[PDB]
């Protein structure tokens, strides 16, 4: 059985590095992370000093 | 990093109050709730005495 | 077996009251109405004196 | 010919009143506003003292 | 309030039995599981000796 | 000209048998049923003793 | 209150004429037909001597 | 950089001629119109003497 | 078994004639073409002297 | 690099067996078939003596 | 009230840099740009000497 | 007439470089590749030593 958690990673450098930020967080607290699906991307501008890239992923992990 | 939980709130008064019912529940058990996205709405009729409005939301919260 | 009819309700007050207007109509002419799913919302402005809220629902009813 | 502008209205009271906030703004600066389609709804929580309801609409107006 | 968890069940026999595999897992660890919505289906071929059917479901459960 | 009716069939055995339950009902009351498109699938759990599979179909029939 | 019926019109000439074929049928049997939304288009080739264009529409009519 | 404007053209003859009606309007007031994407089609019936075909397009133009 | 190929036809006259341009090409090189589904439409303007209508279709053919 | 082919399998028994019919065909003519994604399901009724279940899949295979 | 403009940025280096190209343009001519949502990505190949990455964004800005 | 092939490119560096990996493969075996549309992105984690970025594209090429 797999389960997915819906995480948004952020990076001031790229959409790829924001996806990696969400996956790193998942791997700190979950075992058996097996793949992530991008479901959305965006850029925070007003609320920040530097633009922040956001990549939202479903991060799948195998249960047991 | 943000994470989202997928909650359906209910209200016998309105779609807005059913969204608030899901967000109140999230805020009772999560810190740093930052925003909710509506993803679906519906109305329970058969199973109930009064119509019940349902508003399903992804409730985002900032991790740490 | 359930069947759905695709109805748009209208209200000069709210999206919730326009959903109720479609469901009331379904319950006047159908037995066993069991739930409704919102599929669209909009507001009539040009063609009317007051703004009219519209909420389109699939209204499900149990057949027999 | 119709044209649409993509506006997000906000309200501390309801999704209906946030849709009206976007339409009022359109009517202050456009002639011949004829109807609006809801395309998204959400609630601002972290960044505000009171929850703020948001209703994003395509606001259509007739050109000439 | 309902909450949903996003699970993928697997079966070497059918899409129905893979949906049941995700729901059985949910019922082992959650109380008040009330319904599941299929959101995707697929078949693992390369990585396995027998084809494995996968049925991904949002499994809804009533909170309290 | 074809017309479609939106029916949900149920079965305690499989998604295929729930699609057949909706089509059998259509064929009892409509002439010239020509094909069905699956548009959704789900499983009733809380409200029932046995899980019930549901397969919602647009059932197309040729008019005349 | 509006209701919609889901009809597919056919024409050996164009997608526009197949939409008109579905609307003409609706107007033969319904009062107060007010507008149609195209939801799909396709072309029958194998089963026919001439290609047949198909335009599927939700045909809305005002109830009363 | 391209920008898109969301226009609905109308024609009493065809969906193609309603798309052309939106593009002609864009070309009267914009320089460098480069392509249009159809996003919706429909037919006005109740409000008019003749059926009016509508084709909504994103009309893209190159900025500078 | 059916297979589909994803083709975009073009025409300087109509969306219907651009769909026919993709289907004619499929029938020149495939046997047993049985039907086509429209999946997108657009109009080339900048790159051409006359507007060119484009209709993208999945063209299905029966294998053997 | 993976490539996908879009195949519809058929079965007079189930949606699972129609998915297997498309995958078997892919494996007869392609090397390195690695997984399939269901994208649509339907049932042929008018044109046949027995109902025929159809399951359309993108069948992915690894290139080289 | 927020408004969105639909811009496509281009870059010969990355999807992230094409999103930044659309946002920079928005910030040259709009005040209060607050965030952008990616809605599409693609790559121009035939018409150019170097591949050009394109990232289309809705760029939101706060009105007043 | 254009045709599209559905390819997934992979890269251990970025989503942009995985899109380029699919396009390079298309250009090795097809003439007249003219543009690619991103349709999905994801990251392989479990099955690999380094994360692998995947970008799935429809790669369009002009036929003749
Ligand atoms: C992707 C992205 C989306 C956002 N959406 C909203 C919104 O709907 N309303 C709001 O007040 N702030 C918003 N802030 C947003 C920031 C980012 C970065
Ligand atoms: C929004 C809404 C949806 C529902 N959907 C179903 C359904 O598919 N099948 C069922 O047995 N009961 C259902 N009950 C439902 C109740 C509500 C309120
Ligand atoms: C939600 C909403 C949508 C509408 N859409 C159209 C349209 O496409 N064309 C038209 O002539 N009138 C329209 N009138 C519309 C009115 C409402 C209220
Ligand atoms: C609807 C809604 C959406 C938002 N989305 C985001 C987001 O993606 N990222 C962010 O930093 N802030 C966000 N803020 C948001 C606020 C609202 C109210
Ligand atoms: C449904 C299904 C989907 C999959 N998708 C991918 C994919 O995108 N990339 C990959 O390396 N492996 C994949 N493996 C997949 C296996 C299954 C069973
Ligand atoms: C598919 C499926 C969906 C359902 N959805 C809902 C829902 O939204 N709310 C509710 O009160 N009951 C629900 N009951 C549901 C039962 C089934 C079987
Ligand atoms: C638009 C269009 C779609 C069709 N789809 C199918 C299908 O899925 N399976 C089948 O046996 N015949 C089909 N026949 C089809 C014919 C037309 C015209
Ligand atoms: C495409 C089309 C859509 C329309 N939609 C609506 C609607 O939702 N409500 C309304 O009062 N009038 C409507 N009028 C409409 C007219 C056209 C032509
Ligand atoms: C439908 C249509 C779409 C197109 N899209 C693009 C695009 O995204 N970028 C570009 O450089 N040229 C484009 N050219 C396009 C031309 C047509 C006709
Ligand atoms: C899934 C399914 C879809 C079909 N769709 C169509 C259609 O649009 N028009 C037609 O003439 N025949 C059709 N035949 C169809 C048969 C099947 C089995
Ligand atoms: C993303 C992308 C899309 C495009 N689409 C089209 C199209 O549909 N037709 C055309 O003639 N040229 C096209 N050119 C395109 C170029 C790019 C870069
Ligand atoms: C994007 C991506 C998707 C995948 N999906 C699946 C899946 O559904 N099931 C499975 O067994 N393996 C999977 N492996 C996957 C790997 C990647 C990289
Ligand atoms: Cl989710
Ligand atoms: Cl419907
Ligand atoms: Cl838009
Ligand atoms: Cl495809
Ligand atoms: Mg930096
Ligand atoms: Mg987002
Ligand atoms: Mg009350
Ligand atoms: Mg729901
Ligand atoms: Mg009043
Ligand atoms: Mg509507
Ligand atoms: Mg107040
Ligand atoms: Mg929004
Ligand atoms: Mg076995
Ligand atoms: Mg999946
Ligand atoms: Mg049994
Ligand atoms: Mg359902
Ligand atoms: Mg003729
Ligand atoms: Mg169809
Ligand atoms: Mg005329
Ligand atoms: Mg429209
Ligand atoms: Mg000519
Ligand atoms: Mg296209
Ligand atoms: Mg048999
Ligand atoms: Mg199909
Ligand atoms: Mg360079
Ligand atoms: Mg694009
Ligand atoms: Mg490296
Ligand atoms: Mg994928
Ligand atoms: Na989730
Ligand atoms: Na219907
Ligand atoms: Na717009
Ligand atoms: Na394809």
Q: What is the resolution of this structure in A?
A: 2.0
Q: Which residues contact H45 (CB under 8 A, 6 or more apart)?
A: G23, G27, G33, G34, G35, G36, H51
Q: Is B12 in contact with B51 (CB distance < 8 Å)?
A: yes
E54 annotated as ligand-binding: yes
> Per residue in F35-62, is it b (16+ CB within 10 Å) or e — as a string?
bbbbeebbbbbeeeeebbbbbbbbbbbe
- CA-to-CA distance for B14 and C49, rounded, in angstroms? 25
Residue L40 near chain A (CB below 8 Å)? yes
Three-state DSSP class for residue E48 = coil
Rounded Cα distance between C23 and C4, Å, is: 12
Quick check: D47 contacting B, CB < 8 Å? Answer: yes
Q: Which residue's entry shows tokens 């809705």?
A: K58
**Which ligand places an atom closest to the C-alpha of J43?**
10
Burial of residue E18, with CB atoms counted within 10 A of its CB: 0-12 exposed, 13-18 middle, 19 or more buried: buried
Is B51 an 8 Å CB contact of chain A?
A: no
What span, in angstroms and rounded, lies between the C-alpha atoms of K57 and D39? 16
Within K1-51, strands assigned E span 2-11, 33-44
Alpha-carbon torsion, ordered D9, D10, D14, D16, to 10 deg: -10
Is D35's C-beta closer than 6 angstroms to any atom of ligand 3?
yes
Ligand 14 midpoint to CA G5 (Å): 7
Residues with CB under 6 A from ligand 8: C 8, 42, 44, 54; G 35, 37; H 42, 44, 54
What is the spatial distance between Cα K1 and Cα A22, in angstroms, rounded to a whole number? 31
- Secondary structure element (H or E) that encloses residue D12, with its range: none
Q: What is the Cα gyration radius of chain F?
A: 12
Give residues with Cβ within 8 angstroms of D8, minimum separation 6. D18, D22, D40, D54, D55, D56, D57, K1, K2, K3, K4, K60
Tokens in use for F30? Answer: 């409509």
Site to probe by mutation for ligand 10, drawn from F33, F35, F36, F61 as the one with most ligand atoms within 8 Å of Cβ, is: F35
J52 burial level (CB within 10 Å; 0-12, 13-18, 19+): middle
Nearest CA to ligand 6 atom 12: B44
Pairing of strands J2-11, L2-11: antiparallel
Of the CA atoms within 13 Å of residue L33, those in its CB half-sphere come to 23
Residues of E in contact with B25 (CB under 8 A): 1, 63
Report helix angle F15-29 to E15-29, nearest 10.
120
Question: Residue H19 pairs with which residues in a beta bridge?
Answer: none
> Closest Cα to residue L55, out of L36, L40, L34?
L40
Among residues B9, B7, B20, B23, which one has the least CA distance to residue B54? B9
Chains E and C touch (3+ CB pairs under 8 A): no
Q: Which domains does chain C have, with CATH numbers?
A: 1-64 (3.30.1660.10)
Token pair, residue F14, equals 């499989």
> Beta strand J2-11 with J33-44: parallel, antiparallel or unpaired?
unpaired
3-state secondary structure of L49: coil
C41 among the known binding-site residues? no
Q: From ligand 42's centre to the CA of E26, what distance in Å?
A: 33
* C-beta atoms surrounding L47 within 10 Å: 9
> How many residues does this entry show for chain K?
64
Q: Which chain B residue's Cα is nearest to A21?
A: B1
K50: how many CB neighbours lie within 10 A of its CB?
Answer: 8
Strand intervals (E) in D12-62: 33-44, 52-62
- 8 A C-beta contact, residue B37 and residue B26: no
């Amino acid at each position: 059985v797999f389960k997915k958690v819906l995480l948004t990673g952020t990076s001031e450098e790229s959409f790829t590095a924001a996806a990696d930020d969400a996956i790193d967080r998942a791997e700190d607290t979950l075992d058996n992370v097996v793949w992530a699906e991008v479901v959305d991307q965006g850029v925070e501008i007003g609320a920040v000093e530097e633009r922040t890239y956001q990549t939202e992923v479903q991060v799948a992990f195998e249960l047991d």
